[PDB]
Every structure is written in structure tokens, then in C-alpha cells.
Amino acid sequence: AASGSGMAQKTWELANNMQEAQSIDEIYKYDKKQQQEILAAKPWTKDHHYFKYCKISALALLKMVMHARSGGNLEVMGLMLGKVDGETMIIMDSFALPVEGTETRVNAQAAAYEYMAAYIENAKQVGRLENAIGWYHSHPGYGCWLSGIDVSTQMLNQQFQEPFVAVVIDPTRTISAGKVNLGAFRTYPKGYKPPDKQYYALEVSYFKSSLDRKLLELLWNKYWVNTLSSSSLLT
Amino acid sequence: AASGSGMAQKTWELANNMQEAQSIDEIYKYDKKQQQEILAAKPWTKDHHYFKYCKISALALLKMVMHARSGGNLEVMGLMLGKVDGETMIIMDSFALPVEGTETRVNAQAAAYEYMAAYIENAKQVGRLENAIGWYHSHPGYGCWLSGIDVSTQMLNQQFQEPFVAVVIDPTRTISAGKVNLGAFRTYPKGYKPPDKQYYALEVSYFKSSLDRKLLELLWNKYWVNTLSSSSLLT
Ligand SMILES: [Zn+2]
Ligand SMILES: [Zn+2]
């Protein structure tokens, strides 16, 4: 019973310190009006430390995790959707870039940011559109941080794609239902030396909307079933 | 020269009879006014034979094909974004679902449809999508038709989702650049006794764009590389 899917979903929710909320229901700090005054004001572009916070939906987290896990020891890659509410960036959704490989990365500086921006460009202005609030890739066993290419890529993002964030994730290990290894990062412009590194880490929190729940259930189901197919991890 | 990706993409386009265009031009019979006219009219359910036509963006096609091929012998499932132009259904884009592909299906009638409808409902309610014109899956080596769970699924889809199409793809015998094996299908209410099965095939055409050129190229590239990884057929 505690070995079943639901008790596992609950354990995993607990280890990750989630919240049950309304998308607001305290999630948003700011009311719609003052959300828009900030959106229009663009308090970043001036303060480089402006964004101190990142909040990720259970849904977007789970899909990312499953993506990173399915990809194995290959580094996988994807984008993320969401809204900026003040200094807090909110990721409502995530998904997988159709093109997996490191040649879009290692072979040139801007290659990855260009694929990213062209995909986005196409994925709005035509069907279903978006607002893309960042990108994510996996560091399967070397942990969560930014490589030189992560950093150059994220800098191009924070020039052209702003607001944008880079999410790194390391699916390996972590028990069965247990703390995700994740990080969310922003770069600094080419000059910046706020001298008390070219990037910094936001503070990540997890939450789940009330309409996430059935999807969350099917998804977590598949995820847990595939957990059971490789095991002696849960002993 | 012709053993490179560029000329192979040429051969593929030619072999699929892709016609070039830009956006609103020459793919559409109509402009938004009338499209909205009949869009309110709901000519379908008048005529069960209403839509005779399906046109697929080359990006949707290549993406579905890459997904289908990567899937191997697993039956793969994804969604399609498009719009109704007259009796023509137009597919702008596709993308992968987190496929169970089986247990999302065989263990109950409405489960597949339920999952897709929850995915779509989710995406839409954040303001995204609105564009889903249908769904696609693959029959890897058994060819293009509807299996009767496909038929139940799609009958539901047409009840609730209604302007929805069911696409089936068979990702075999690539022969480098070749004709895709694909079909597009609509079902009948089963409150029907057709003029003379429980479904019918549309007439599929493929089409290309201007701005897509880089994106396609990118996709095509990966695709080509993947075929170079196993070839006794490139002799
Ligand atoms: Zn990295
Ligand atoms: Zn089928």
C-alpha cells in the first residue's frame, strides 16, 4: 500500500516540500495590475540581481524528470513555460526539444541559443504560441551547475530572450520518491563584477495547481511503473 | 554531393510532392472572415463527409516521422496543431506525448482519449494551444489504418473535440529519402449507416514554408545523421 503509486506520489511530494495552491493562492505575490506594472517597468535591465526566486510546478518538474531519466546518460534538453511575478520566476510547464544532441552545442557558440530561439519563434506567432520563461538540460551524474557553453548560451538568452532562466537537473540516484537534484541559474552581463563567477543560483520551490492533478496522476503512474521495472533500488 | 544531407532533403521533398509557399498564401482557399463564418456554421454534423482534405506542414511531418522512427517497434503517440480551412484540415505542427502507448489504452475504452483531452485541456487553460486539430500514432511495420481502439478513441474525439483528425504513420523502409506511409482518418457516429467501414480516409498533401527553412534544415540534419548510423540501404 505504501509501496503503491499514490503513497509514492505523496512521499515524493513531501520530500520535495511542495505546496498545494491555486496558481496564485499565495503563489503570486503581486496582483494582476502590479504584475503588469512590473512587466512593463522591467526592473531587470537595471538590477542584475533582480530575480531571487524560482517556482516550478509539480507537472513541469515531473515531465522534466521523466525526460532526463528516459534519456539516460545522454544529456537531454528542453524548454520551460511560465510567468514572471516580481522577483520570482514561475514555471508552469516544460517540454522536450525534438532535437537531442551535443552538436547543437559543442560545434559553435550560439548554435544552441539559435535553435532555441527559432523553435520558440516558430512555436508562437503560429500554433499554441507560448511564453517561454527558460530552458533546461541534464547533467546525469555530474550534478547541477553551469558549463562554459551553458553560460554563453544563457547569456545570449538573457540578451535576446529576457526574462529567461537556465534550469539544470541531475536525475541519478535519489532513492525512489525523494528530493529532486535541480538548480536554476541566471548569468551576468559580460562586464559585471559585483565583488562583495559569471552566474548565480536562484532559490527553487515546488508547487502543484489544482488542475495539474489528473495529469499528475497519469504521469506519476507511468513514472512509478517504470521505476518498478528497474529495482532492487527500492529494497 | 547527393550523398549529403542537402540533396537527400531535396529527394525527400520531391518524393513527397511537397509544394512550397509562405504562411497564409496559397495553402488557404480562404481568409479569416469566411473561415470564421463556417467556423460558426459548423458545416460538419451536417455532412459526415464534410472534410475531404488534410495538408501537413513539412515540420509536423518530419517531426512525426522522427518520433515514429525513434520509437522503433514501440507504438508512438503524439498530438497535432492546426486549423480548419473549409473542408481542408491544416496541420501546422506536431509533438510527442509522454507515451505509455499501451496501458493508456488497452485497459479501458476512454482512457486514451481521456489522457489526450486532459493534456489538451491543461495546455489550453493556461491560454496555450487552442490549436489542436487532431492526434497521431504509429503502426511500425503493419501499415496505416484504424484498429478499432483507434476507432473508439477517435469517435470520442469527434464527439467532444469535434474538429479533430486521426493520423496514422508507418516509419518503415525509409530508403533514405522516400514517400512517407501516412494516412488521415475521420470516424462515423455509429448512428450512421454509410452510403457504400466505421471510418474514412482524407486526401493528404504536404507543404513547406519560408521561415521554416533553417528549422527544417536542423531537423533534417539530425534525421539524416540517424540514417547514416545504420545503412545496408545506403549501398
Ligand atoms: Zn550543462
Ligand atoms: Zn492504431
UniProtKB/Swiss-Prot annotation, chains A, B:
Domain of life, per lineage: Eukaryota
Shown part of the complete sequence: 2 to 257 of 334
Organism: Homo sapiens
Entry remark concerning the domains of this protein: The JAMM motif is essential for the protease activity of the CSN complex resulting in deneddylation of cullins. It constitutes the catalytic center of the complex.
Keywords from the UniProt entry: Acetylation, Cytoplasm, Cytoplasmic vesicle, Hydrolase, Metal-binding, Metalloprotease, Nucleus, Protease, Signalosome, Synapse, Zinc
Role summary: Probable protease subunit of the COP9 signalosome complex (CSN), a complex involved in various cellular and developmental processes. The CSN complex is an essential regulator of the ubiquitin (Ubl) conjugation pathway by mediating the deneddylation of the cullin subunits of the SCF-type E3 ligase complexes, leading to decrease the Ubl ligase activity of SCF-type complexes such as SCF, CSA or DDB2. The complex is also involved in phosphorylation of p53/TP53, c-jun/JUN, IkappaBalpha/NFKBIA, ITPK1 and IRF8, possibly via its association with CK2 and PKD kinases.
Compartments it resides in: Cytoplasm, Cytosol; Nucleus; Cytoplasm, Perinuclear region; Cytoplasmic vesicle, Secretory vesicle, Synaptic vesicle
Coiled coil (residue ranges): none
Effect of H137Q: Abolishes ability to deneddylate cullins, without affecting the 'Lys-63'-specific deubiquitination associated with the COP9 signalosome complex
N-acetylalanine, modified sites: A1
Enzyme Commission no: 3.4.-.-
Cofactor(s) named in the record: a divalent metal cation
Additional remark text: The CSN complex is associated with some 'Lys-63'-specific deubiquitination. Such activity is however not mediated by the core CSN complex but by the BRCC3/BRCC36 component of the BRISC complex.
GO biological process terms held by the UniProt record: exosomal secretion; negative regulation of apoptotic process; positive regulation of DNA-binding transcription factor activity; positive regulation of transcription by RNA polymerase II; post-translational protein modification; protein deneddylation; protein neddylation; proteolysis
Any one GO cellular component localisation term in the record: nucleus
EC supergroup of this enzyme: hydrolase
GO MF annotation list: deNEDDylase activity; enzyme binding; macrophage migration inhibitory factor binding; metal ion binding; metal-dependent deubiquitinase activity; metallopeptidase activity; transcription coactivator activity; translation initiation factor activity
Protein name, per record: COP9 signalosome complex subunit 5
Binding site for Zn(2+): H137, H139, D150
Chain positions of motif JAMM motif: 137-150
Predominant location category: cytoplasm
Assembly and oligomerization: Component of the CSN complex, composed of COPS1/GPS1, COPS2, COPS3, COPS4, COPS5, COPS6, COPS7 (COPS7A or COPS7B), COPS8 and COPS9 isoform 1. In the complex, it probably interacts directly with COPS1, COPS2, COPS4, COPS6 and COPS7 (COPS7A or COPS7B) and COPS9 isoform 1. Interacts with COPS9 isoform 2. The CSN complex interacts with the BRISC complex. Also exists as monomeric form. Interacts with TP53, MIF, JUN, UCHL1, NCOA1, HIF1A, CDKN1B, BCL3, GFER, PGR, LHCGR, SMAD4, SMAD7, ID1, ID3, ITGB2 and TOP2A. Part of a complex consisting of RANBP9, Ran, DYRK1B and COPS5. Interacts with IFIT3.
Protein family per UniProt: Belongs to the peptidase M67A family. CSN5 subfamily.
Residue ranges of domain MPN in the record: 54-191
